[model samples]
Target: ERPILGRFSSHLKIGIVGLPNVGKSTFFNIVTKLSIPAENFPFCTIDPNEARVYVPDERFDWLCQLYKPKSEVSAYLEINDIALGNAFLSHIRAVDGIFHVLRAFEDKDSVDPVRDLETIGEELRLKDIEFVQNKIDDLEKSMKRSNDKQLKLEHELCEKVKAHLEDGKDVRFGDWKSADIEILNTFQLLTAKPVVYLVNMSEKDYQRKKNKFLPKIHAWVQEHGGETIIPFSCAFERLLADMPPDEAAKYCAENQIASVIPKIIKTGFAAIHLIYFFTAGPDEVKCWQIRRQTKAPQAAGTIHTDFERGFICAEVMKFDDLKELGSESAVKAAGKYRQEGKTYVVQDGDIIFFKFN
Candidate 1:
């Protein structure tokens, strides 16, 4: 049997968080199709609800159509619907990324989007401060026991992180070395994760591509290392989800509501610096996720330990070649197939057949 590479079923999990009544649950429901309670009141979602959303890839669909494979698979993004409270911060800590949903729609209560953003930002900062302080305390105790080099380094890093947090800045805003980030990753600091600002808008605002708070939000995000801001209408998307696909397509076209989930998934990937490659055949056609610049043998290891251990080379086909030639055989006939060595960096959209003993 041919082994599949990377975390195929295990998509990256992004925590969906915001203050109450920001359409976090509504957005979650639209993407995941899981009906979680989205009430008007605060603290409606106490326990986190999770759903896996398959990211739409035109390439995957095209390949599937070309091959007419018995089984087809696409990459997915996992979303955790979380509540707005200090007690639920633990849930957010486990996620690889964060989607901070902000309400841009007009509210009867005159709740300010900018104010809500600050509130969530402060909450995250506070949580990070507590984490850094505790880590510093632990490192000090460890250093007192033994003056190890690693311990000293960790202690220094923790102090720097603590100072940054105490100054009311997120850990991600700092210019960090890979080593520092590696050490900090162990702590699972909330502020260290990449964040995507999901601005929930009204139909009018979405159509007009205008929100008064958009400019202010953009400035804030830019100051904090330039995170992505996705403006979408949760209510409209939810309504589309309930309708038939054809009907929904017509409705979306008529109402000028573009598909939002794909944008969210794409932005999510960008946030975490992820790219995906593919493996195709009649039995199964699958997409595999990996970070940029991953080499051949190590990437092969994502399939199976044996594949990596006995890696010879990879038979690679460029997506453009396949699209142009219409088949693997035609691509090979046109001299487009390549044999790549262990050091070869896998490119996005590469269709690879791993050669292993």
Candidate 2:
């Protein structure tokens, strides 16, 4: 058995999920501005909503202005607004990262962000437990008839996973060996996915950057599953949504508030281990999303298979250098640009020109 090439899938998804009526879809609508309902009632969104989000990169925008490209393409992420339905646990397994939305307001119900987090975490672990237990049951029947070593190995792995999940531990918490991940991929356990907790708060609490639930939620998350937690407010974001950018900026400055949308978007992109680099020319400026630690040839192949097949070298320039120097020529003069071979690993915010047959 050998290693595979590139990512198995070209498009990786990041999902948004939470208990009903937590305004989960509100976060989706703001980022995507897609025509989906986020109402006061539960299960308002009848079907699953998905949108390809445009990643905001200042360096890409700067490159566009420098080249004045006739065609500009930005990086994108497929953000799925998962339904609050029976099959959601199964659905979550297909996604790379999980965004758990917790209600931290005082409207219809009392605010208990810790319990909301516990419920979400517990539910995910429960999903993993169910799958692992069923696998063990089938494995037991198979092992009884055959003395195949492969099946026995898999059975042992399943037993270990089942025990961990049964003991109230996440699949990610286990000390799994690198080789054991092959079988784990088949299970596609829910608790195996990375998570980010979103705390939707009141407008005043958000503007102040402090909420009553903030300290408690952080404490609970640290104790159980220490993942990223983002505090945002639908009410404030909605108000900013309708206002002009200049007006919104003024309002935010006056209230000492920063938009959580960008943070959420950036974190979501990184959570999937995806990063983008730019290719700029007078004709086009493109943002290419590739897996982290991708090699030069593989990264080029994403644009066209021919680029990798007849591979040569990549002309690399750091985006930060150009931005700091104000032009490509300035960056070159400053000795910040260089050529890299096929073994080169592409870095985030890189500006590259590929050479090939």
Candidate 3:
């Protein structure tokens, strides 16, 4: 059953991780437009830096034109630039998803991407094992103090996880039941989060779609529960950022390069299973992110706590209907607008108006 007030919604925070000099900082700079010092040395980014990326939505654009609202807001995701090392493990674990940037260009004595992937994967798995072992030790002490069934069950689950990690397996790659996932959620294991492998290819490789490292990376991601992989040129994206809009479009058309930041953000949102709904009026047209399959009242809570607590019903319109009809009143006249009860599952691109005391 859905909670009366839906689960709290938060922006999808993705960590940009890779070995040093893999265009991690360049990609971060292009997306965020911040001139952070992206030096070529290992561990240059000592402190984690962050940037907010506004997600692009055509529906929100149309609504802005339709309402001419005093204020307009779009849904956004947060990306963190994490320094490479165990010192930043907590930051990586805290993020909702991971963006592993793999080097595809030919540097002097080029590094093998396959080896890099395996190295990072092993490191994350080892960290998870260490965390799980500590958790098991604490649980053992707690079990000795009292005969608690929940504690015992959790201890058993931790043991199972420890064994899996000891066998050099990622927890995310393991096949665990729903109950086991619930027990493991409290630990925030690094291996459990969704990962998007971003292959930073050179212009020639990007145009050819012929990066040799990509196949192995794809296979690894597939073996680990079908994570997302995106291949693009960070250099190309940076060039686009520096170019005029018309020139950039022409360059992209000539070079066969599409915008990377939007695609990355869109994939990131999907990796985290996030969807957006909107509230539009003369005062504002704002986009809100919620988990997919979110019920009406809980979605209303995204606006205000009072709305969720006192929600009666919601008048909803499909974005397509609104766009086609030209206005809210036209949609109402066409009887396409709907009054949905609390149990109604909100759809993406829904323009909703909630009624409550």
TM-score of each: 0.88, 0.87, 0.88
Please give the lDDT score for candidate 1: 0.79
lDDT of 1 by residue, 1-100 (tens): 1221112223456888888778987887776673333442144343347766666788888899988899887766667887767678878876778888
| lDDT, each prediction | 0.79, 0.80, 0.82
Candidate scoring better on lDDT of 2 and 3 = 3
Question: Considering every candidate listed, which one attains the maximal lDDT?
Answer: 3
Candidate 2 Cα outliers beyond 4 Å, as residue runs: 1-7, 34-48, 145-147
Displacement of residue 271 (Cα, Å) in model 2 is 1.0
Which scores higher on TM-score, 2 or 3? 3
Error (Å) of candidate 3 at residue 89 is 0.8
RMSD of each predicted structure? 6.0, 5.0, 5.2
Give the local distance difference test score of model 2: 0.80
TM-score of 2: 0.87
